[PDB]
Each structure stands twice: as structure tokens, then as C-alpha cells.
């Protein structure tokens, strides 16, 4: 069976509340969907990013994927990476490749009649999640509500944003901690908001104020040296985490020497095929791995990562994916468990619902 055709489409979905973090504001999410048909089946895969990702799939990647053996997604992946040298590998191009690869892996699993997790090397029956949102735009009550909600649903780890208005953050982390109590892990994400010495101040302060155990993207993160300084000088018990903007394997390799926990986003780092490589980087450096965003695809992919510590149950995406797809997984109890009776990703586009949000 050969890959017959890719169909690309895009959707823009308003957030349920205006959102912000340390370095950005936004009020919608755009999903780019790839469907690959071949051998009488079809696979689906997606990324989040600009609408121009769809034009890039159609322009550079459709002619590479079409006609290919449907049973070997990594071979197409290799040809796709070679093809886009001039067109631009990182950013939009890498998001485009990740979407197609995920679709092609879903297509392969379905041609075999298997759940994707059983078409992949499998270390985990289920994977642990952390509930993630707590945007800097939320009033205290809504912050407390959202994180408390996840806690009571049996998710013992939650992440919130800091660093947009640093003077307001002490009260925000205290509020979060009071709502969830001592038994839940409290994680923060600065999204690149701090300078090095400011980051260093805040890592200490947040630890003292609310007993945080995780600090993500303290500094700009182009800033590898500042990451390494925070890794080396940060407080005990506060893991320094980064990696969402790493587009390639060599970048991931560099990053792994500067953090306590390495991150990658399956929708940016090259899809399933790319994410399959993070494991050797993380076992090699002996550090934990944490998946970033896109929970519905990550749940399958992360069953293959030995070094997984948790995946991110990111609010925007869990909501968009629940709205556009039938087949998403419920994080209740703190883990996602791929459904053994659904082949591939187990995800079906709800066509009329999505037509409503066409970009």
C-alpha cells in the first residue's frame, strides 16, 4: 500500500478566556490537520502554529509523501527533511513535517489494524500527566479553580504561568498552593520572561513562598548559557526545564547539557519519528524527559519513551482536541491510557463541528 493523497485543512478556535503568559498574549489557537489516505485506510495528524503551515504541507510535502510506501513513515520523514533544505527546516517547515509524519504513522498503524502505541516500541501501559494552564490573565479565583479542579480529578501535578507581572507573582503562587494543598506538585513556567539574575532570584523565592518543584523556561532559552547557570546555581528540589522550541535533534543534544528535565513538543520536533529519537538523548545524558503540549498525540508517542517523567495536559489543546475530535483520552486519575480497541491514534475529526471553525 502506497500513500495516495494528503488533504490539508486548518481551524482557528477561540480560547475560552483571554490568555497570556510571561512573553505573549493570545485568544485563539490554530490547528493544521493532515489526512493521509492509502491502501483503503486513512491516518490523521496535526500541528499548532500559523495557517501558512497548511500551504507549506501542500507546497513542499504532499509530492514527497504521495506515492510512498505507506508502511514506513520514517523513510518519508527522511526525504521530507532533505526536500525542505532551502524552504526552511525549522519553525513552519518542522511543524508541517511533524503533522504529516503523525498522519503517516496513524496511517501505518491503521493499515496494520493496531493501536499506534502497539505499533511503536512500548515501555508504558499508560503515561502520567500534569494539568497545565494557570495563565497570567486569570484572576486569583479562576487560577485556584482551574488548578484545584485538576487536583480533585486525581491529577497530582499542576503547572501555572509566572513572570508577566513579577510583583503580583508571590500572591498568585501562594493562592495556587493554598487551593491545592501540600500533596500536589506545583510547577511554574516563565516562558522566557526573566533575565538570568532575575530568574535566579525567582527560583529561590517561589521555592520559599509555595514550594515549587519545577521551573520552565526561566530565561529566553536561545540563552543556553543562562539555562546552564540556572541549572548549576538553582535551589535543590526545583527542576530547571526547557526544550519546546527545539526543532532538531542536534539542538536537543545541546540543550540536554543545560537543563534538569528536557522537553520537546511532538508537533514541532518532527512528529513521532523525531520524538522516537529523544529517548537516546535523554538516556545518554541520564536526564528525565517531559512532553510539551498536544496531549492527544503525545499520549501514544510517549508510551515509547523510557525516560518519560510526564506529558503536559495543556489546557488550550486538551480543549481544542476534545472539540474537533472524537476519541481523545480522559486524564482522570493522573495518566492517559491509549485505548487498546481503537487503531492508530483513535481520533476521528468531527466534521460539522470543525467546519464551524475553518480558518
**Region binding a second copy by CB under 8 A among candidate stretches 131-139, 199-207, 325-333, 343-351:** 199-207
Residue (of 12, 11, 98, 116) closest to 57 by Cα position: 98
For residues 123 to 152, the per-residue mask of contacts with a second copy, x marking binding by CB under 8 A and - elsewhere, is xxx---------------------------
Closest to Na ion by CB, 289 vs 325, is 289
Euclidean distance between CA atoms 108 and 41, whole angstroms = 9
Q: Which of residues 166-195 bind a second copy (CB under 8 A)?
A: 195
**Region binding Na ion by CB under 5 A among candidate stretches 26-34, 106-114, 215-223, 251-259:** 215-223
Q: Which of residues 146-205 bind Na ion (CB under 5 A)?
A: 189, 191
Residue 189 touches which member of Na ion, a second copy, none, C-beta under 5-8 Å by kind: Na ion
Distances (CA, A) of 221 to 55, 110, 227, 229, 325: 29, 38, 7, 12, 33
**Region binding a second copy by CB under 8 A among candidate stretches 156-164, 284-292, 294-302, 330-338:** 284-292
- Run of H or E including 264: strand 261-264
Closest to Na ion by CB, 23 vs 52, is 23
Residues 347/326, Cβ–Cβ less than 8 Å: yes
Report if residue 277 touches a second copy, rule: CB under 8 A.
yes
Residue 118 touches which member of a second copy, Na ion, none, C-beta under 5-8 Å by kind: a second copy
Task: Tell me the three cell numbers of residue 38.
Answer: 492509502
Residue 323 touches which member of Na ion, a second copy, none, C-beta under 5-8 Å by kind: none
**Region binding a second copy by CB under 8 A among candidate stretches 110-118, 133-141, 149-157, 344-352:** 110-118
- Is 206 buried (19+), middle (13-18) or exposed (0-12) by CB count in 10 A? buried
H-state helical runs in 164-223 = 169-180, 196-210
Closest to Na ion by CB, 68 vs 137, is 137
Residue (of 308, 316, 196, 225) closest to 262 by Cα position: 308
For residues 16 to 45, the per-residue mask of contacts with a second copy, x marking binding by CB under 8 A and - elsewhere, is -------xx-x-------------------
Task: Tell me the three cell numbers of residue 232.
Answer: 548549576
Task: Tell me the three cell numbers of residue 98.
Answer: 511533524
Amino acid at each position: 500500500p502506497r500513500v495516495e493523497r494528503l488533504e490539508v485543512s486548518a481551524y482557528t478556535v477561540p480560547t475560552d478566556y483571554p490568555e497570556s503568559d510571561g512573553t505573549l498574549q493570545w485568544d485563539s489557537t490554530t490547528m493544521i490537520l493532515v489526512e493521509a489516505h492509502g491502501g483503503g485506510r486513512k491516518g490523521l495528524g496535526y500541528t499548532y502554529g500559523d495557517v501558512s503551515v497548511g500551504r507549506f504541507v501542500e507546497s513542499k510535502l504532499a509530492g514527497v509523501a504521495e506515492g510512498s510506501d505507506a508502511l514506513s513513515p520514517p523513510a518519508v520523514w527522511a526525504r521530507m527533511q532533505a526536500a525542505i533544505r532551502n524552504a526552511g527546516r525549522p519553525g513552519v517547515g518542522a511543524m508541517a513535517v511533524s503533522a504529516v509524519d503523525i498522519a503517516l504513522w496513524d496511517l501505518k498503524a491503521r493499515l496494520l489494524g493496531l493501536p499506534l502505541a502497539d505499533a511503536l516500541p512500548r515501555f508504558h501501559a499508560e503515561v502520567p500527566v500534569y494539568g497545565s494552564g494557570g495563565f497570567t490573565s486569570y484572576p486569583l479565583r479562576r487560577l485556584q479553580e482551574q488548578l484545584g479542579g485538576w487536583a480533585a480529578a486525581g491529577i497530582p501535578r499542576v503547572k501555572m504561568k509566572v513572570g508577566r507581572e513579577p510583583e503580583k507573582d508571590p500572591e498568585r503562587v501562594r493562592a495556587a498552593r493554598e487551593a491545592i494543598g501540600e500533596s500536589v506538585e506545583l510547577m511554574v513556567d516563565a516562558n522566557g520572561a526573566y533575565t538570568r539574575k532575575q530568574a535566579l532570584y525567582w527560583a529561590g523565592a517561589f521555592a520559599r513562598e509555595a514550594g515549587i518543584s519545577y521551573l520552565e523556561e526561566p530565561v529566553s532559552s536561545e540563552d543556553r548559557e543562562g539555562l546552564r547557570l540556572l541549572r548549576d546555581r538553582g535551589p535543590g528540589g526545583v527542576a530547571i526545564a526547557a526544550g519546546e522550541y527545539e526543532w532538531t535533534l542536534p539542538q536537543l543534544h545541546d540543550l540536554a547539557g543545560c537543563v534538569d528535565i528536557l522537553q520537546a513538543d511532538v508537533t514541532r520536533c518532527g512528529g513521532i519519528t523525531g520524538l522516537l529519537r529523544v529517548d537516546g538523548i535523554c538516556r545518554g545524558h541520564q536526564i528525565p524527559f517531559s512532553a510539551h503540549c498536544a496531549p492527544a498525540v503525545s499520549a501514544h508517542a510517549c508510551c515509547a519513551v523510557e525516560s518519560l517523567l510526564h506529558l503536559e495536559y495543556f489546557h488550550d489543546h486538551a480543549r481544542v482536541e476534545r472539540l474537533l475530535f472524537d476519541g481523545t483520552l480522559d486524564p482522570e486519575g493522573g495518566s492517559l491510557r491509549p485505548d487498546p480497541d481503537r487503531p492508530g491514534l483513535g481520533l476521528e475529526l468531527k466534521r460539522s463541528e470543525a467546519g464551524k471553525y475553518a480558518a
